[PDB]
Scaffold this active site. Structure first.
Site, short mmCIF file in Angstrom:
data_model
loop_
_atom_site.label_atom_id
_atom_site.label_comp_id
_atom_site.label_asym_id
_atom_site.label_seq_id
_atom_site.Cartn_x
_atom_site.Cartn_y
_atom_site.Cartn_z
N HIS A 85 49.20 7.39 12.98
CA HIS A 85 49.69 8.63 13.65
C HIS A 85 51.22 8.64 13.63
O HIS A 85 51.82 9.70 13.30
CB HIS A 85 49.13 8.72 15.06
CG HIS A 85 49.75 9.81 15.88
ND1 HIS A 85 49.58 11.13 15.56
CD2 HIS A 85 50.51 9.77 16.99
CE1 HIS A 85 50.21 11.87 16.47
NE2 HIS A 85 50.80 11.07 17.33
N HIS A 145 45.95 7.20 18.57
CA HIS A 145 47.37 6.96 18.93
C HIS A 145 47.85 5.60 18.39
O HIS A 145 48.36 4.77 19.17
CB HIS A 145 47.58 7.13 20.43
CG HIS A 145 47.56 8.55 20.87
ND1 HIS A 145 46.44 9.11 21.45
CD2 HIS A 145 48.48 9.54 20.78
CE1 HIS A 145 46.69 10.38 21.75
NE2 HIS A 145 47.95 10.67 21.35
N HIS A 202 57.46 7.62 18.71
CA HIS A 202 57.19 8.59 19.81
C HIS A 202 55.96 8.17 20.63
O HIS A 202 55.86 8.66 21.76
CB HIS A 202 57.07 10.03 19.28
CG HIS A 202 55.71 10.35 18.74
ND1 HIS A 202 55.31 9.95 17.50
CD2 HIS A 202 54.68 11.03 19.27
CE1 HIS A 202 54.07 10.34 17.29
NE2 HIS A 202 53.65 11.00 18.38
N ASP A 203 55.05 7.35 20.11
CA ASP A 203 53.82 6.95 20.85
C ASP A 203 53.75 5.42 20.97
O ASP A 203 52.64 4.88 21.17
CB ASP A 203 52.55 7.54 20.22
CG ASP A 203 52.17 8.95 20.66
OD1 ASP A 203 52.40 9.32 21.82
OD2 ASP A 203 51.57 9.66 19.84
N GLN A 255 38.07 23.35 20.10
CA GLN A 255 39.09 23.41 19.02
C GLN A 255 39.63 24.84 18.89
O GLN A 255 40.88 25.01 18.84
CB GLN A 255 38.54 22.85 17.70
CG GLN A 255 38.37 21.33 17.69
CD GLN A 255 39.69 20.59 17.77
OE1 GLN A 255 40.54 20.70 16.89
NE2 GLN A 255 39.89 19.86 18.85
N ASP A 259 53.84 16.43 15.98
CA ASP A 259 52.86 15.67 16.79
C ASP A 259 51.46 16.26 16.60
O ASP A 259 50.50 15.46 16.56
CB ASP A 259 53.25 15.66 18.26
CG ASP A 259 52.60 14.54 19.03
OD1 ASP A 259 52.14 13.57 18.40
OD2 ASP A 259 52.58 14.65 20.26
C1 LIG Z 1 41.10 22.28 24.89
C2 LIG Z 1 39.91 21.56 24.30
O1 LIG Z 1 38.66 21.54 24.82
C3 LIG Z 1 37.87 20.82 23.99
C4 LIG Z 1 36.43 20.52 24.23
C5 LIG Z 1 35.75 19.67 23.37
C6 LIG Z 1 34.41 19.38 23.62
C7 LIG Z 1 33.77 19.93 24.73
C8 LIG Z 1 34.46 20.78 25.59
C9 LIG Z 1 35.79 21.05 25.36
N1 LIG Z 1 38.60 20.38 22.98
C10 LIG Z 1 39.87 20.83 23.14
C11 LIG Z 1 41.01 20.54 22.20
C12 LIG Z 1 41.09 19.01 21.98
N2 LIG Z 1 42.48 18.61 21.72
C13 LIG Z 1 43.53 18.54 22.75
C14 LIG Z 1 44.78 18.07 21.97
N3 LIG Z 1 44.29 17.90 20.59
C15 LIG Z 1 45.11 17.49 19.52
C16 LIG Z 1 45.12 18.03 18.28
C17 LIG Z 1 46.10 17.35 17.53
N4 LIG Z 1 46.68 16.44 18.30
N5 LIG Z 1 46.09 16.51 19.57
C18 LIG Z 1 46.38 15.70 20.68
C19 LIG Z 1 45.46 14.70 21.02
C20 LIG Z 1 45.71 13.88 22.12
C21 LIG Z 1 46.86 14.04 22.88
C22 LIG Z 1 47.77 15.02 22.52
C23 LIG Z 1 47.54 15.86 21.44
C24 LIG Z 1 42.98 18.23 20.54
O2 LIG Z 1 42.32 18.19 19.51
MG LIG Z 2 52.32 11.04 22.92
ZN LIG Z 3 51.75 11.64 19.20
#
Ligand SMILES: Cc1oc(-c2ccccc2)nc1CCn1ccn(-c2ccnn2-c2ccccc2)c1=O
Ligand SMILES: [Mg+2]
Ligand SMILES: [Zn+2]
EC number: 3.1.4.17
Length: 313
Positions: A72, A68, A106-107, A269, A217
């Site tokens: 970004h 962040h 935005h952040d 993911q 975002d």
């Molecule tokens: C649901 C889940 O569970 C696990 C997991 C991993 C390891 C072990 C067990 C579970 N991983 C995820 C998804 C992770 N995740 C969440 C948002 N983003 C993201 C992608 C682009 N921007 N953002 C974003 C980042 C911060 C804030 C807002 C948006 C992201 O990658």
């Molecule tokens: Mg934000």
């Molecule tokens: Zn953002």
């Protein structure tokens, strides 16, 4: 006035594409943003002296956090640039002005922690802003920078146009609260399918702009695989720090933030692409057909995470 920004040939060409990466040279990011404002909005939109002073004050107010951060901010502004450039006639003069600035801001002053961690910590910002905590803070920081002497890039707007643009920026920044995305997309989905969606209805425009903001975002998932994969490390670097801090408050974090559960990242993911990312770019592509390359790139990256799980990488 006659002072354009010009990028090297490879950047001049690739910056027009949705999947452009702004590169590791931080000193070129301000120039890249001004370039995008000039082509998206015009050389007249902002006083160059004021814009440059606004940009450097915004940069100064982003922190040295893994994800962040300033990179970004500029990355999200470029995705918005690509959407605006591929949807020429759909957006007003004020909207093009507002949204590039909204994306850059935005952040602002993000600490690398979620709204949920601020609330469980009992941070002062959680008392001031009960919902969309960090996003109200990001808007507050934007207004503060706009009110520094020599920083008011909207000075040449009329009173009502100035109020309209700050309202565009406020809604755009609040919309980057992912908690609000699910309901916004569902309403846009129903509106599109029943055929009630009307871009002259301000409340409808607001929702479309909200989805655009979510799309920009999340745009790390729409890059070429090596960019998406390396950005994931920075995202999880913050999640795992928050998880550590949850453990210090005596709360087991969700697995996404628990570094002991690194192994489960590929399946995490997948869920995220299926539950958030793919739905987002699908609804965006239905409303704005020229944004289809974001959906295609997102699908390509889903396929890459499926390959990681199957042990092929
Ligand atoms: C649901 C889940 O569970 C696990 C997991 C991993 C390891 C072990 C067990 C579970 N991983 C995820 C998804 C992770 N995740 C969440 C948002 N983003 C993201 C992608 C682009 N921007 N953002 C974003 C980042 C911060 C804030 C807002 C948006 C992201 O990658
Ligand atoms: Mg934000
Ligand atoms: Zn953002």
């Amino acid at each position: 006035g006659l002072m354009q920004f010009t990028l090297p040939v490879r950047l001049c060409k690739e910056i027009e594409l949705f999947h452009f990466d702004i590169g590791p040279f931080e000193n070129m990011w301000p120039g890249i943003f001004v370039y995008m404002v000039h082509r998206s909005c015009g050389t007249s939109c902002f006083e160059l002296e004021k814009l440059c002073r606004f940009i450097m004050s915004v940069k100064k107010n982003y922190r040295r956090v893994p994800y962040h951060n300033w990179k970004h901010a500029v990355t999200v502004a470029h995705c918005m640039y690509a959407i605006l450039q591929n949807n020429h006639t759909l957006f007003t003069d004020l909207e093009r002005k507002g949204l590039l600035i909204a994306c850059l801001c935005h952040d602002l002053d993000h600490r690398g922690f979620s709204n949920s961690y601020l609330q469980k910590f009992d941070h002062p910002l959680a008392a001031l802003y009960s919902t969309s905590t960090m996003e109200q803070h990001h808007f507050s920081q934007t207004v503060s920078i706009l009110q520094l002497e020599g920083h008011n890039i909207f000075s040449t707007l009329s009173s009502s146009e100035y109020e309209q643009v700050l309202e565009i920026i406020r809604k755009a920044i609040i919309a980057t609260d992912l908690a609000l995305y699910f309901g916004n997309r569902k309403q846009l989905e129903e509106m599109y399918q029943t055929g009630s969606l009307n871009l002259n209805n301000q409340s409808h425009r607001d929702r479309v702009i909200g989805l655009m903001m979510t799309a920009c975002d999340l745009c790390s998932v729409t890059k070429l695989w090596p960019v998406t994969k390396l950005t994931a490390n920075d995202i999880y670097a913050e999640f795992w720090a928050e998880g550590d801090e949850m453990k210090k408050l005596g709360i087991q974090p969700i697995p996404m933030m628990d570094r002991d559960k690194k192994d489960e990242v590929p399946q995490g993911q997948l869920g995220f692409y299926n539950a958030v990312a793919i739905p987002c770019y699908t609804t965006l592509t239905q409303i704005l057909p020229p944004t289809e390359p974001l959906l295609k790139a997102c699908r390509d990256n889903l396929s890459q995470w499926e390959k990681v799980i199957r042990g092929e990488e």
